């Protein structure tokens, strides 16, 4: 039915550790408006989970699709 | 091919404003391990974008699916 599309940019990735000492990568995605950026999604992924997704590098453009009962985050086409 | 599934819980929603004075809701999703929680996704959505998704309330269980070139975030079944 309805759908919203957000163009995101990966501005930051940082290695962090929980109390288990399990490693995650904190990935910050912002939207550009006007020229400023607002945060839109921050993900914390293990190194495995990132491999599964594919490349998600700083400077990459990310599509965030919001529809009824689903948010999808994909690389740009 | 490969796929990773994360069970998330919405622990927090907070009203915030960018410099445009545009309203977003900051939504924090954590994973339970052991008993502790680690952050997994933080989303900033306008009130419209949230309507499109459906209900996303504090205490709700969220599935995060990671596959090649896509992360999907859906309500629990």
Q: Do B43 and A41 touch (CB under 8 A)?
A: yes
In the numeric block, the tokens 């599509």 are attached to A63
In the numeric block, the tokens 């809701």 are attached to B25
Q: Report CA torsion sign: B48, A37, B27, B68.
A: positive
Taking CA atoms, B10 is separated from A10, B1, B29, B32, B40, in Å, by 23, 29, 4, 11, 10
DSSP string of B49-60?
HHHHH----TT-
Report resolution (Å) to 1 decimal.
2.0
Name A54's bridge partners: none
Q: In the 8-state DSSP scheme, what is residue A34?
A: -
| Residues belonging to chain B with any Cβ–Cβ distance to chain A shorter than 8 Å | 2-4, 6, 18-20, 22, 24, 33, 36, 38-45, 48-49, 52-54, 66-75
Name A8's bridge partners: A62
Q: In the 8-state DSSP scheme, what is residue A69?
A: T
Please name the member of A19, A52, A73 whose beta carbon is closest to the beta carbon of B68.
Answer: A52
Q: How many domains does one find in chain B? A: 1
For residue B53, what are the domain limits? 1-77
Dist CA B5 CA B12 (whole Å)? 21
Name A46's bridge partners: none
How was this one solved? X-ray
Nearest-CA distance B58 → chain A (Å):
16
User: Nearest to residue A13, comparing CAs of A36, A47, A38?
Assistant: A47
Q: In the 8-state DSSP scheme, what is residue A48?
A: H
Please name the member of A33, A42, A68 whose beta carbon is closest to the beta carbon of B42.
Answer: A42
Question: For the stretch B11-41, what's the b/e string if a residue is b when 16 or more beta carbons lie within 10 angstroms of its beta carbon?
Answer: eeeeeeeeeeeeebbebbbbbeeeeeebbbb
């Amino acid at each position: 039915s309805h759908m919203s599309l957000i163009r995101g940019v990966v501005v930051s990735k940082q290695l962090v550790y929980d109390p288990t000492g399990t490693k995650y990568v904190k990935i910050d995605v912002v939207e550009e408006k006007e020229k400023i950026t607002v945060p839109r999604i921050t993900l914390w992924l293990t190194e495995e989970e990132e491999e599964v997704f594919g490349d998600i590098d700083v400077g990459d453009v990310i599509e965030i699709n919001i529809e009824n009962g689903a948010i999808t985050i994909k690389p740009e086409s």
